[PDB]
Design a protein around this ligand. Structure first.
Ligand code: HEM
Ligand code: HEM
Ligand SMILES: C[C@H](O)[C@H](O)[C@H]1CNc2nc(N)[nH]c(=O)c2N1
Ligand SMILES: C[C@H](O)[C@H](O)[C@H]1CNc2nc(N)[nH]c(=O)c2N1
Ligand SMILES: CC(=N)NCc1cccc(CN)c1
Ligand SMILES: CC(=N)NCc1cccc(CN)c1
Ligand SMILES: [Zn+2]
Lengths: 420, 420
């Protein structure tokens, strides 16, 4: 195209013209002579530990969002729009910052998710519960908001989307950081015999909680303590009330022996280490959650090598021909494990989506976004399920990726930064 | 990095610094504000039907390759290098073109494959048989070279890499085009009852051969006739000697009923519709072949929706719960089908590689290319197998993609262009 890029679905032949990319301003990390589409943290905006943005750098960014917001409600250049702008301009000049109206905070949150190029479940983008935790001032208060979130979202297995937003970053006042990767996760212990008990991806965090006092049960599926950081103060340990952490015992609809593998997982996926940016405002603590896509647990959490890595054992138990890789025994154990997850979650009536339905609705969503927003940023490398990618429609779907604001961003783990 | 990009393997944590990308000059299609890493034909150089490159545009490109070639043999700026350059400069001035020495043609061919960012089997790059078909002048002569290629490469099931290079493009003299996508492929017929018999992806080509006289057996696995175009003359039909087309009957090492599905495939993957560019020279007819990676046939050729699409039938026969998608019945049928392919090919002793071993050696190859060539262009979207992607090491492998020359490129199907 000359300026209206096209994306084609190669299985269906459908074509979509993108005009939305012209609103992008952040960099992708790619050039004209190089593509970094498969790089995890291309760092085009992977946050910096350095000082906070300034007054000059702040208003343009704040204005951009507000011009965007009022345009959304077809009120661009209104008396209201204009006064709001002077309002924030005036408020930034004095305080070096500014506070978003409650409506603006919801728009910004919903849209950060609508713009998350790596999320395949964005069709749910408009249905999000926003918990304004901006008045919070302590870790205990943070703990409380988090508990309410957990309970609200789990909703006795009938999961609901939600995000809790703590105080924005200021400068000296300080940062609020949920030191945990996800609200709910299992511990990992480096055994003296080389082996690792529990999720290996958490061995480094688990060591923090312990050197902070945690009474580690030292088992396989030990839900880790919350370690909250409020107003730039040292984090504090908190135990999520067990009765609030919904879990699901993994069993197979045919292999009764599967049960004996002792596999269990939590039903609430709550990302809590990213950053929400709206109008140039940084919300370093914005735990968000939705519900699982089966492969997340079955393929990655369980079968990833550096994670639980249950391929052999599951394979052995199946009595599979592990003599050579051409027996596709890994692929076989992998399909069964994933059938056990969906089956289990669905048996206990906990919300879950399989890769087939998930990716099917994303195409539907893409079609909505191109038919109403002029496009949709999608990261093909992330949107395509980690198993049977080709038999899911998104594989054959060309996808344009670009960075839109407001958005969710990665940020430095605080234990690297924080002193004391 | 500041100029030395880094790629990390997220499962192994290994890191590789790339310096090779600085040699790139062709565009990727990506910008600073947009990524097109998941676009099939980003058209940065998807050929053009327009006139051929000119004398001025030709020498720089020719020089680049020669400077590259002599640098390879540590002879940069030699008397030889310099005289060769004047040689070609002189030869281009008179003829508007130039002919590559036989050594240069092999270097260029091997490296087009070494630079093919989308090919996962490049570890085999240095072991390639080059058949110089530049003296060819007819379709019959083209047919002959092709037959020798087939026979050579099949090597009674002990497949060998090879590429046959026909006369370069000139201007008026004309184009040589193997009108076939791949040397060996099956026909596809649009049934009156809506249905499609045989590979649907070939229904449009099959119609050409028929309106050219082909006596279509009108079955499911009808190897199509060769339709060769020589010196810009109308293509001509040729039947590959049946005794040269090695095929493999698909059966399963446990499901005797699988046999009854009547699945068969050819063992020689021979791409014949691309373009080889060396020193600015265009080789519009350069059929190349290696050997199969199981998923190519099992996942794509067979299960792709718009292809053979054998999911249901295979699933039904398995007596799988197709009530809902969460039964992962597609995933189940998909794993079995692929076990049948490897098993079959390996039984008849025909060369084949599974995704596990294939992707394992690519990592090994990447490590070689970074440890000796300063890098390796890889397209993550293509290099990752269409099934069980996450349990194969390349999924966790960050990959930098850039365009190096010499290379293989896509080109317009000639029936759209060619008159008469
Ligand atoms: C309704 C359920 C949802 C589903 C099924 C869904 C599914 C997915 C999946 C499968 C991933 C991959 C995670 C990984 O591989 O680590 C992902 C990533 C992501 N999702 Fe969603 N999502 C949903 C809701 C949410 C919510 C509520 C938000 C925000 C309001 C969100 C924001 C994102 C972001 C930012 C990522 C990128 C993660 C990263 O870059 O590390 N998702 N999602
Ligand atoms: C020794 C066996 C080889 C293996 C196992 C291998 C494997 C692969 C696979 C699995 C694909 C994907 C094809 C598709 O999805 O349509 C591919 C693509 C490709 N391979 Fe290789 N390859 C090998 C040899 C060759 C040879 C001999 C050449 C050239 C000298 C070559 C050049 C390429 C190119 C240019 C592509 C890109 C196709 C496209 O863009 O449409 N390959 N290869
Ligand atoms: C839309 C998307 O680019 C397209 O479906 C790609 C994805 N990856 C692929 N990878 C390989 N090896 N082969 C293909 O044909 C494709 N198709
Ligand atoms: C190296 C590569 O970028 C990395 O392994 C990516 C690939 N695609 C992914 N896709 C999803 N959804 N999640 C991931 O963690 C990854 N990892
Ligand atoms: C909401 C959802 N389905 N998954 C997002 C997610 C959950 C846990 C960890 C991570 C780390 N990227 C992401
Ligand atoms: C050599 C190899 N393994 N496969 C390359 C290939 C074979 C047939 C068709 C196509 C179309 N892209 C590519
Ligand atoms: Zn890119």
């Amino acid at each position: 195209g000359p300026r209206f890029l096209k994306v084609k679905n190669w299985e269906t032949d459908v074509v979509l013209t993108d005009t939305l990319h012209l609103k992008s301003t952040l960099e992708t990390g790619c050039t004209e002579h190089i593509c970094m589409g498969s790089i995890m943290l291309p760092s085009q905006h992977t946050r910096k530990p350095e000082d906070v943005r300034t007054k000059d750098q702040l208003f343009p960014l704040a204005k951009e969002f507000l011009d965007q917001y009022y345009s959304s409600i077809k009120r661009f250049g209104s008396k209201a729009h204009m006064d709001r702008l002077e309002e924030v301009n005036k408020e930034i000049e004095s305080t070096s910052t500014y506070q978003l109206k409650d409506t603006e905070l919801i728009y910004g949150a919903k849209h950060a998710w609508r713009n998350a190029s790596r999320c395949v479940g964005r069709i749910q983008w408009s249905k999000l519960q926003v918990f304004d935790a901006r008045d919070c001032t302590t870790a205990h208060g943070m703990f409380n908001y988090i508990c309410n979130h957990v309970k609200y979202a789990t909703n006795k297995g009938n999961l609901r989307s939600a995000i809790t937003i703590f105080p924005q970053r200021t400068d000296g006042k300080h940062d609020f950081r949920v030191w945990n990767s996800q609200l709910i996760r299992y511990a990992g212990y480096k055994q003296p015999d080389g082996s690792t008990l529990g999720d290996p991806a958490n061995v480094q965090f688990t060591e923090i909680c312990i050197q902070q006092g945690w009474k580690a049960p030292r088992g396989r599926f030990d839900v880790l303590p919350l370690l909250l950081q409020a107003n730039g103060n040292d984090p504090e340990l908190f135990q999520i009330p067990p009765e609030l952490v919904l879990e699901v015992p993994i069993r197979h609809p045919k292999f009764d022996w599967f049960k004996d593998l002792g596999l269990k997982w939590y039903g609430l996926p709550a990302v809590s280490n990213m950053l929400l940016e709206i109008g140039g405002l940084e919300f370093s603590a914005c735990p968000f959650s939705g519900w699982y896509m089966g492969t997340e647990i079955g393929v990655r959490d369980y079968c990833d090598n550096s994670r639980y890595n249950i391929l052999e054992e599951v394979a052995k138990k199946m009595d599979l021909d592990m003599r050579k890789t051409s027996s596709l025994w890994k692929d076989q154990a992998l399909v069964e494990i994933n059938i056990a997850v969906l089956y289990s979650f669905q048996s206990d009536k906990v919300t879950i989506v399989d890769h087939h339905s998930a990716t099917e609705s994303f195409i539907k969503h893409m079609e909505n976004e191109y038919r109403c927003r002029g496009g949709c940023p999608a990261d093909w490398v992330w949107i395509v399920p980690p198993m049977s990618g080709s038999i899911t429609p998104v594989f054959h779907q060309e996808m344009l990726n670009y960075r839109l604001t407001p958005s969710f961003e990665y940020q430095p783990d605080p234990w690297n930064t924080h002193v004391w």
